[PDB]
């Protein structure tokens, strides 16, 4: 199917700062990937983003009733919907399960990678740190970064490049809004 | 900002495909099944706490359809440029032999929002237990999508996620096998 495609998108966005103390509403219209006209609650009128959107900005700005609908949206739309979903979105908290296992940076070689696998947490903000015998190790640390699972949970792998010596105890430490104190998992060689 | 809630809509010609969904900080709260005219909550618990009149989504999509016609004309029928996807396959938890896990196929950074996705087990299409999300919006106004496959890890099976998109010259296969 080589037929040309044409795509319309609309995004009605509500931006929240300090709960609902400060709210910004954006009414955004897109043709393909390009935004061509928008209503910003900071402005209170539509503005063309590209020349293509100018007729719409001018037509919509001539409709006082339409503009007042958009101007009230921070209250009637944004603050309202925030209230509706707050208990299971804003307040959603799921602790991570933390696993440590050894790995290899290159096949055949002995174990020289410690993986701290952090799974199933929400929200996304998280801090994972490695310790060797109680001392934070900041060198040789690489990660997958923050991975969205698409199902309201996240995961991340935080790896430490190291050559384990007998007696050493390694610790992966995880801080997260769902936790009241750091979660630690030890690994011994 | 602390949080962002986005009501994201699209309509695509000539496919006559339209989507309506709500996003909270990058996760889907719900979308509307246009054919069934029903609200589909991303997690079932969501629907115990909130409701949505699906009909309102239908009205918006009709407006989006009419607007697309107008804009297509205004642009002198300038079509979308295909942007092929990036594809990643991962598991949802650390893998242990014969311990139930889930394969995730993440399809990212693409447009238009049309894709064929197939799970392959040992080179064969599998559909038992699979699930998927609708098209999820990106801040660069491309799209994201997830496909899922519950599976029982073994040394004998390999998997691939096969993705077809008009921006690809050939289908993209991303492999997974037990480490």
């Amino acid at each position: 199917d080589t037929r040309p495609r044409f795509l319309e998108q609309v995004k009605h966005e509500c931006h929240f700062f300090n709960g609902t103390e400060r709210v910004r509403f954006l009414d955004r219209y897109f043709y393909h990937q390009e935004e061509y006209v928008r209503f910003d609650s900071d402005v209170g009128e539509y503005r063309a983003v590209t020349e293509l959107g100018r007729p719409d900005a001018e037509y919509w700005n001539s409709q006082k009733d339409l503009l007042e609908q958009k101007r009230a949206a921070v209250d009637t739309y944004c603050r309202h919907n925030y209230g509706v979903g707050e208990s299971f979105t804003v307040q959603r908290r799921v602790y991570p399960e933390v696993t440590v296992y050894p790995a290899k940076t290159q096949p055949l070689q002995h174990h020289n990678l410690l993986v701290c696998s952090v799974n199933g947490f929400y929200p996304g903000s998280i801090e994972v740190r490695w310790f060797r015998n109680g001392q934070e190790e900041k060198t040789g640390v690489v990660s997958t970064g923050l991975i969205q699972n698409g199902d309201w949970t996240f995961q991340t792998l935080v790896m430490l490049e190291t050559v384990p010596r007998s007696g050493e105890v390694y610790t992966c430490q995880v801080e997260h809004p769902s936790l009241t104190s750091p979660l630690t998992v030890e690994w011994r060689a | 900002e602390e949080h962002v809630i986005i009501q994201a809509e699209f309509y695509l010609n000539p496919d006559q495909s339209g989507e309506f969904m709500f996003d909270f900080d990058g996760d889907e709260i719900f979308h509307v099944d246009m054919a069934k005219k029903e609200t589909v909550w991303r997690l079932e618990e969501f629907g115990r706490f909130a409701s949505f009149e699906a009909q309102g989504a239908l009205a918006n999509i009709a407006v989006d359809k009419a607007n697309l016609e107008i804009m297509t004309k205004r642009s002198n029928y300038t079509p979308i440029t295909n942007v092929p996807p990036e594809v990643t396959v991962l598991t949802n938890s650390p893998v242990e032999l014969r311990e139930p896990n889930v394969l995730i196929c993440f399809i990212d950074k693409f447009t238009p929002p049309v894709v064929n996705v197939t799970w392959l087990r040992n080179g064969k299409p599998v559909t038992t237990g699979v699930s998927e999300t609708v098209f999820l919006p990106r801040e660069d106004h491309l799209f994201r999508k997830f496909h899922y496959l519950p599976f029982l890890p073994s040394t004998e099976d390999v998997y691939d996620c096969r993705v077809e998109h008009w921006g690809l010259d050939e289908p993209l296969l991303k492999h997974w096998e037990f480490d």
């Binding site: 719409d56 | 719900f30 949505f52 009205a59």
Partner: peptide
């Protein structure tokens, strides 16, 4: 509570 729909503005023909 009930989620509210923001509507989409109609372009001129």
């Amino acid at each position: 509570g009930v989620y509210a729909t923001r509507s989409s503005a109609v372009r001129l023909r």
